[PDB]
Design a protein around this motif. Structure first.
Motif, PDB file in Angstrom:
ATOM      1  N   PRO A   1       0.869  -1.169   0.000  1.00  0.00           N
ATOM      2  CA  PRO A   1       0.000   0.000   0.000  1.00  0.00           C
ATOM      3  C   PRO A   1       0.914   1.230   0.000  1.00  0.00           C
ATOM      4  O   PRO A   1       2.094   1.061   0.300  1.00  0.00           O
ATOM      5  N   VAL A   2       0.457   2.413  -0.410  1.00  0.00           N
ATOM      6  CA  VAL A   2       1.320   3.596  -0.410  1.00  0.00           C
ATOM      7  C   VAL A   2       0.885   4.558   0.694  1.00  0.00           C
ATOM      8  O   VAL A   2      -0.284   4.936   0.765  1.00  0.00           O
ATOM      9  N   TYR A   3       1.812   4.943   1.576  1.00  0.00           N
ATOM     10  CA  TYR A   3       1.502   5.873   2.662  1.00  0.00           C
ATOM     11  C   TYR A   3       2.250   7.180   2.424  1.00  0.00           C
ATOM     12  O   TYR A   3       3.449   7.274   2.679  1.00  0.00           O
ATOM     13  N   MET A   4       1.534   8.188   1.960  1.00  0.00           N
ATOM     14  CA  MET A   4       2.059   9.537   1.856  1.00  0.00           C
ATOM     15  C   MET A   4       1.940  10.160   3.245  1.00  0.00           C
ATOM     16  O   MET A   4       0.857  10.129   3.850  1.00  0.00           O
ATOM     17  N   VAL A   5       3.048  10.651   3.790  1.00  0.00           N
ATOM     18  CA  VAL A   5       3.043  11.279   5.107  1.00  0.00           C
ATOM     19  C   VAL A   5       3.554  12.698   4.956  1.00  0.00           C
ATOM     20  O   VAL A   5       4.741  12.906   4.691  1.00  0.00           O
TER      21      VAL A   5
ATOM     22  N   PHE B   1       7.447  -5.590   2.808  1.00  0.00           N
ATOM     23  CA  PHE B   1       8.105  -4.824   1.758  1.00  0.00           C
ATOM     24  C   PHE B   1       7.149  -4.167   0.777  1.00  0.00           C
ATOM     25  O   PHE B   1       7.604  -3.387  -0.065  1.00  0.00           O
ATOM     26  N   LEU B   2       5.861  -4.496   0.834  1.00  0.00           N
ATOM     27  CA  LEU B   2       4.874  -3.890  -0.052  1.00  0.00           C
ATOM     28  C   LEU B   2       4.431  -2.517   0.430  1.00  0.00           C
ATOM     29  O   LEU B   2       3.698  -1.832  -0.289  1.00  0.00           O
ATOM     30  N   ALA B   3       4.839  -2.115   1.632  1.00  0.00           N
ATOM     31  CA  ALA B   3       4.419  -0.847   2.204  1.00  0.00           C
ATOM     32  C   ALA B   3       5.440   0.231   1.881  1.00  0.00           C
ATOM     33  O   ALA B   3       6.609   0.147   2.283  1.00  0.00           O
TER      34      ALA B   3
ATOM     35  N   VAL C   1      -1.548  11.779   7.114  1.00  0.00           N
ATOM     36  CA  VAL C   1      -1.267  10.483   6.514  1.00  0.00           C
ATOM     37  C   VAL C   1      -2.347  10.200   5.486  1.00  0.00           C
ATOM     38  O   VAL C   1      -3.498   9.951   5.858  1.00  0.00           O
ATOM     39  N   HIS C   2      -1.960  10.167   4.206  1.00  0.00           N
ATOM     40  CA  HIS C   2      -2.812   9.744   3.107  1.00  0.00           C
ATOM     41  C   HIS C   2      -2.411   8.293   2.738  1.00  0.00           C
ATOM     42  O   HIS C   2      -1.278   8.129   2.194  1.00  0.00           O
ATOM     43  N   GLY C   3      -3.185   7.360   3.061  1.00  0.00           N
ATOM     44  CA  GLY C   3      -2.929   5.950   2.769  1.00  0.00           C
ATOM     45  C   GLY C   3      -3.753   5.481   1.477  1.00  0.00           C
ATOM     46  O   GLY C   3      -4.926   5.738   1.427  1.00  0.00           O
ATOM     47  N   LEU C   4      -3.017   4.883   0.588  1.00  0.00           N
ATOM     48  CA  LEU C   4      -3.633   4.355  -0.634  1.00  0.00           C
ATOM     49  C   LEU C   4      -3.617   2.826  -0.576  1.00  0.00           C
ATOM     50  O   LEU C   4      -2.554   2.194  -0.642  1.00  0.00           O
ATOM     51  N   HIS C   5      -4.819   2.251  -0.532  1.00  0.00           N
ATOM     52  CA  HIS C   5      -5.092   0.845  -0.280  1.00  0.00           C
ATOM     53  C   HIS C   5      -5.742   0.211  -1.509  1.00  0.00           C
ATOM     54  O   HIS C   5      -6.350   0.886  -2.354  1.00  0.00           O
ATOM     55  N   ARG C   6      -5.657  -1.110  -1.565  1.00  0.00           N
ATOM     56  CA  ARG C   6      -6.509  -1.839  -2.478  1.00  0.00           C
ATOM     57  C   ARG C   6      -7.915  -1.906  -1.915  1.00  0.00           C
ATOM     58  O   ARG C   6      -8.121  -1.912  -0.701  1.00  0.00           O
ATOM     59  N   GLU C   7      -8.883  -1.983  -2.814  1.00  0.00           N
ATOM     60  CA  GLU C   7     -10.256  -2.196  -2.405  1.00  0.00           C
ATOM     61  C   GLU C   7     -10.401  -3.626  -1.907  1.00  0.00           C
ATOM     62  O   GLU C   7      -9.639  -4.517  -2.304  1.00  0.00           O
ATOM     63  N   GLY C   8     -11.388  -3.854  -1.035  1.00  0.00           N
ATOM     64  CA  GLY C   8     -11.602  -5.219  -0.606  1.00  0.00           C
ATOM     65  C   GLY C   8     -11.567  -5.468   0.886  1.00  0.00           C
ATOM     66  O   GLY C   8     -11.809  -6.600   1.310  1.00  0.00           O
ATOM     67  N   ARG C   9     -11.162  -4.481   1.682  1.00  0.00           N
ATOM     68  CA  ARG C   9     -11.126  -4.621   3.136  1.00  0.00           C
ATOM     69  C   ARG C   9     -12.402  -4.101   3.809  1.00  0.00           C
ATOM     70  O   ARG C   9     -13.073  -3.180   3.333  1.00  0.00           O
TER      71      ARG C   9
ATOM     72  N   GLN D   1      15.473   4.092   1.400  1.00  0.00           N
ATOM     73  CA  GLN D   1      15.974   3.884   0.049  1.00  0.00           C
ATOM     74  C   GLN D   1      16.888   5.035  -0.365  1.00  0.00           C
ATOM     75  O   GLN D   1      16.757   6.174   0.100  1.00  0.00           O
ATOM     76  N   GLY D   2      17.778   4.739  -1.308  1.00  0.00           N
ATOM     77  CA  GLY D   2      18.478   5.792  -2.012  1.00  0.00           C
ATOM     78  C   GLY D   2      17.508   6.573  -2.882  1.00  0.00           C
ATOM     79  O   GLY D   2      16.288   6.476  -2.707  1.00  0.00           O
ATOM     80  N   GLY D   3      18.002   7.309  -3.856  1.00  0.00           N
ATOM     81  CA  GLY D   3      17.112   8.283  -4.470  1.00  0.00           C
ATOM     82  C   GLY D   3      16.300   7.800  -5.659  1.00  0.00           C
ATOM     83  O   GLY D   3      16.014   8.578  -6.571  1.00  0.00           O
ATOM     84  N   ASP D   4      15.943   6.518  -5.675  1.00  0.00           N
ATOM     85  CA  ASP D   4      15.523   5.884  -6.910  1.00  0.00           C
ATOM     86  C   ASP D   4      14.052   5.499  -7.004  1.00  0.00           C
ATOM     87  O   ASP D   4      13.551   5.348  -8.122  1.00  0.00           O
ATOM     88  N   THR D   5      13.354   5.322  -5.891  1.00  0.00           N
ATOM     89  CA  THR D   5      11.949   4.942  -5.955  1.00  0.00           C
ATOM     90  C   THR D   5      11.149   6.035  -6.657  1.00  0.00           C
ATOM     91  O   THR D   5      11.327   7.216  -6.357  1.00  0.00           O
ATOM     92  N   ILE D   6      10.301   5.645  -7.615  1.00  0.00           N
ATOM     93  CA  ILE D   6       9.373   6.556  -8.290  1.00  0.00           C
ATOM     94  C   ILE D   6       7.936   6.104  -8.081  1.00  0.00           C
ATOM     95  O   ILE D   6       7.604   4.942  -8.356  1.00  0.00           O
ATOM     96  N   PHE D   7       7.079   7.030  -7.643  1.00  0.00           N
ATOM     97  CA  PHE D   7       5.659   6.727  -7.484  1.00  0.00           C
ATOM     98  C   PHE D   7       4.780   7.655  -8.317  1.00  0.00           C
ATOM     99  O   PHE D   7       4.897   8.877  -8.232  1.00  0.00           O
ATOM    100  N   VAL D   8       3.884   7.073  -9.097  1.00  0.00           N
ATOM    101  CA  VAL D   8       3.013   7.825  -9.986  1.00  0.00           C
ATOM    102  C   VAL D   8       1.582   7.671  -9.479  1.00  0.00           C
ATOM    103  O   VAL D   8       0.974   6.597  -9.569  1.00  0.00           O
ATOM    104  N   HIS D   9       1.022   8.756  -8.994  1.00  0.00           N
ATOM    105  CA  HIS D   9      -0.379   8.786  -8.607  1.00  0.00           C
ATOM    106  C   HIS D   9      -1.121   9.543  -9.700  1.00  0.00           C
ATOM    107  O   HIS D   9      -0.920  10.740  -9.902  1.00  0.00           O
TER     108      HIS D   9
END
Lengths: 145, 145, 145
Positions: A1-5, A37-39, A65-73, C58-66
């Motif tokens: 999941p992606v957690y923008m903080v 590692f998926l977080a 905290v903006h959390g981006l989740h899969r649907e289904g929970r 991480q080093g400076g390499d992760t890219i996230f596209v929303h």
């Protein structure tokens, strides 16, 4: 999941960023079963004073905290997860709850790519872990606490 | 609401940031009835040239507003809110409508917290306020202008 | 669309930003039919170390596209689009696929504004365009590359 903080610059030290990211990953994996590692926890720092509440300029303490989740929970489990993030970011960052805002947005996994792969849905993720495996399986194994 | 406002660095002076945060706060409370203090404005500043349109790089004039709401309001009223945001930010920030993008994303209230508490439904923000902790009511009462 | 792109600071040279933005704009325009100028690319740079995966910095390499989209498009088309973005960014930015995350969120077209104007439904983009003011049409026409 992606957690923008979202945080003000220099309110979290490097150790406190590691601590908050650990707490958030720990909460997510504990409540959903997702592999560590998926977080992603992705810190967006801005200069203190960039945050306004009710039009009043704020100091450097508000954490969003903006959390981006899969649907289904279930709604119940999302409620628990968000409360536990409230608690655990309170502790990791050593900040009061009043400064903690938490939002979960959900998408179909079929439009969600992690590590360059389309996510399965929680009807998988044990089986899912096959992938571009080898270089990929092992690249994920390292990004784990 | 949480209003993510993406702007180029130092294009708005602090005083102009205050003006845009009051345009937005005033708009949400006027059309929704929510309190004043529930309106977060979070400015994300990036250096000019970070915004590309049709592959063409831009100067520092693009404003992008991502407002996060809870579900339950009509499309009609959301359009009115977005339009008023377009206009009043145009004036507060002194930028043309052609530079203003506004997107509203909606979540169930039960998966959204702030000031450390789960949001209520849009039908009745008075209840929720009077029923919160006294220290929390007083902290929220400080962020009103 | 608005494409929020989260990157480590000064990892993308200006020319690499142009290449990534162009890659995303061309992918969206090619697979959907939208006009070039409707593609917003917004680069959010944070200093390397703001990104955690499984608790590991991480080093400076992760890219996230929303990516922020209107509703109405099929899962099939979104899947191809996400895959095409992964590949085309991997090459434009010179990054491995495992460093690329892509998430699409969708809202109703009635709660979405570009260039200060309400978006149409995806069946509308050309008819939509001609009825914008001649200045709004021309500001858009320059944003094409």
């Amino acid at each position: 999941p992606v957690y923008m903080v979202y945080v003000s610059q220099d309110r979290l030290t490097p150790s406190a960023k590691h601590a908050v990211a650990k707490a958030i990953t720990d909460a997510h994996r504990g409540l959903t079963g997702t592999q560590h590692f998926l977080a992603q926890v992705n810190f967006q720092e801005q200069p203190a004073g960039n945050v306004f509440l009710g039009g009043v300029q704020q100091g450097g303490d508000t954490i969003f905290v903006h959390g981006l989740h899969r649907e289904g929970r279930s709604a119940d489990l999302k409620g628990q997860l968000a409360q536990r993030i409230v608690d655990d970011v309170s502790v990791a960052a050593e900040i009061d709850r009043k400064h903690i805002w938490v939002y979960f947005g959900e998408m179909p996994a079929q439009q969600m790519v992690n590590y360059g792969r389309f996510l399965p849905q929680p009807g998988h993720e044990g089986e899912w872990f096959d992938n571009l495996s080898s270089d990929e399986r092992a690249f994920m194994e390292t990004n784990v606490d």
